[PDB]
Amino acid sequence: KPQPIAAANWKCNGSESLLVPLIETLNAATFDHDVQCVVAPTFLHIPMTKARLTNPKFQIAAQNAITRSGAFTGEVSLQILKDYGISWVVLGHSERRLYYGETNEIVAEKVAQACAAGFHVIVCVGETNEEREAGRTAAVVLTQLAAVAQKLSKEAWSRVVIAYEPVWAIGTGKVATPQQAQEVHELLRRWVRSKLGTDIAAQLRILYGGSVTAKNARTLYQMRDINGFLVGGASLKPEFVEIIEATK
Amino acid sequence: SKPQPIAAANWKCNGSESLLVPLIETLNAATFDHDVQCVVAPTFLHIPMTKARLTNPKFQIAAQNAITRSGAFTGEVSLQILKDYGISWVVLGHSERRLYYGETNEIVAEKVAQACAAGFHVIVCVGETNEEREAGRTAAVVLTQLAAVAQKLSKEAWSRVVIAYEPVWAIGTGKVATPQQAQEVHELLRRWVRSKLGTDIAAQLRILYGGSVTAKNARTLYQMRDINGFLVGGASLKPEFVEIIEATK
């Protein structure tokens, strides 16, 4: 199993009074094993987080980016992030695909540019409840992944991380079962193995997202093809520390 | 008789410490002796650096966009988060969000209403495209855009609202709007406000021009009766911005 990643997506949340004590807790936490931790604050909070997060095992990521600076009021480009020292970015999150029109192609465009620019990218994929019920889970996530892969070169994959978040598990409290999750992870890794190879497939990190907590992390990590988590609400709480330890 | 003017700098999706620090230093060094409210709108990423360094008493910092509530909306920033940080000005409905990021009239109106409720000063952008102007629809398109936000606001909220007219027809085709063309639309916007909302609201409402503004044309534009300032793009990233502010004297 390649090096695990425990990523925290704080979404559109945060305040200074809230965030200072949380960062101190992350600084105080010590992790012996090899694990890559990432925290993703809102653009506005990246400066204070960068300034205070001193734990060597952590890296800061953006929650989104557009491919070019310029006349795009309200947005933040990959270039503006690089210049500020941020080298990790979350792209294609289900909430962006559903509410802000990011199609498979727009997400593929962002990922391609982010890799070219030297970033480590966490690409999100996932089916909706109706897509699951219609029995289209495989078609949906592989079409999402295929869009991104058609633009990538073999070596860009060293900087690619895949996060599987079932949309029916987001904010719902309805976590998938290790077997449902494992079932999808193994399908995604199998696809990659036949297009790009065993070496690329073996090193690829595929994370699970969707109602993860200290109570179900360890069992989820036990599955063969699950390499870590993209955590939502539980990441804005001390419990996030126990989730990282579950990657031992 | 004209209300206090406003010169606002929309830095759009541009910036870096290397470019911004000198620019803030220049603005900090400038002194304006007349009554004018200046605003700079940095990307979210650069608002902390700007807040820690900007000292010119006539300046306020603005965000370039916001969503109505915090929660699970990956990549966005809410009005509540901005207020907690101390930011109380925001630009909403900019032509670039309406065109590239699906913001419709209703979405903009909701954003403005919530922004006013939370205590912000709002610069709401309005404007017609080349296709709409060609079709003779300038008035229909901008009064519609404006009526949509008017319907969600109470009379009192108007004291914290600012309008910015964007000739998207000009911006998008590379043409240049004359000052007569800008006054034309600013006059129809003030007329509507005067008869639908109140003569008291119309006399104090600031209507800003948001097409191409440079130190060259700034003063001729401000000379028009219903232009009260500017929402400046590219030129606001240069020392020239100081001259544009001076033009509202």
Short characterization:
Chain A is α/β, with parallel strands linked by helices. The first copy, chain A, is built from 11 helices and 8 strands.
What does this entry look like structurally?
- Chain A: Belongs to the triosephosphate isomerase family.
- Two copies of one chain form a homodimer.
- Chain A is an alpha/beta fold and 248 residues long.
- Chain A has one domain (1-248): Aldolase class I (TIM Barrel).
- Chain A has eleven helices and eight strands.
- Chain A has helices at 16-28, 46-52, 78-83, 94-99, 104-116, 129-133, 137-149, 178-196, 198-203, 217-221, 240-245, and strands spanning 5-9, 36-40, 58-62, 88-91, 120-125, 160-164, 205-209, 228-231.
- In chain A, strands 1-2-3-4-5-6-7-8 form an eight-stranded parallel beta barrel, surrounded by four helices.
- In chain A, strand 7 (205-209), helix 10 (217-221) and strand 8 (228-231) form a beta-alpha-beta unit.
- The A-B interface holds A 9, 11-16, 42-48, 63-64, 66, 69-77, 80-81, 83-84, 90, 93, 95-96, 99-101, 170-171, 232 and B 10, 12-18, 43-45, 47-49, 64-65, 67, 70-78, 81-82, 84-85, 91, 94, 96-97, 100-102, 233.
List keywords for this structure.
248 residues; homodimer; eight-stranded parallel barrel; 40% helix; peroxisome (chain B); alpha/beta; TIM Barrel; 8 strands; Triosephosphate isomerase, glycosomal (chain B); 11 helices
Into which percent range does the helicity of residues of chain A fall? 25-40%
CATH class of chain A: Alpha Beta
User: Largest sheet of chain A, order of strands side by side?
Assistant: 1-2-3-4-5-6-7-8
Structural class designation of chain A: alpha/beta
Distance between the first and last residues' Cα of chain A: 11 Å
CATH architecture group name of chain A: Alpha-Beta Barrel
Q: What is the count of distinct domains of chain A? A: 1
The profile of the biggest β sheet of chain A is: 8 strands, parallel, barrel
Strand content of chain A: 15-25%
The counted number of beta strands of chain A is 8
Radius of gyration of chain A: 17 Å
Reading the helices and strands of chain A in chain order gives EHEHEHEHHEHHEHHEHEH
Shape of chain A: globular
Oligomer: homodimer
Of all chain pairs, the largest interface belongs to:
A-B, 40 and 38 residues
**Count of alpha/pi helices of chain A:** 11
> At the fourth CATH level, what is the homologous superfamily of chain A?
Aldolase class I
CATH topology of chain A: TIM Barrel
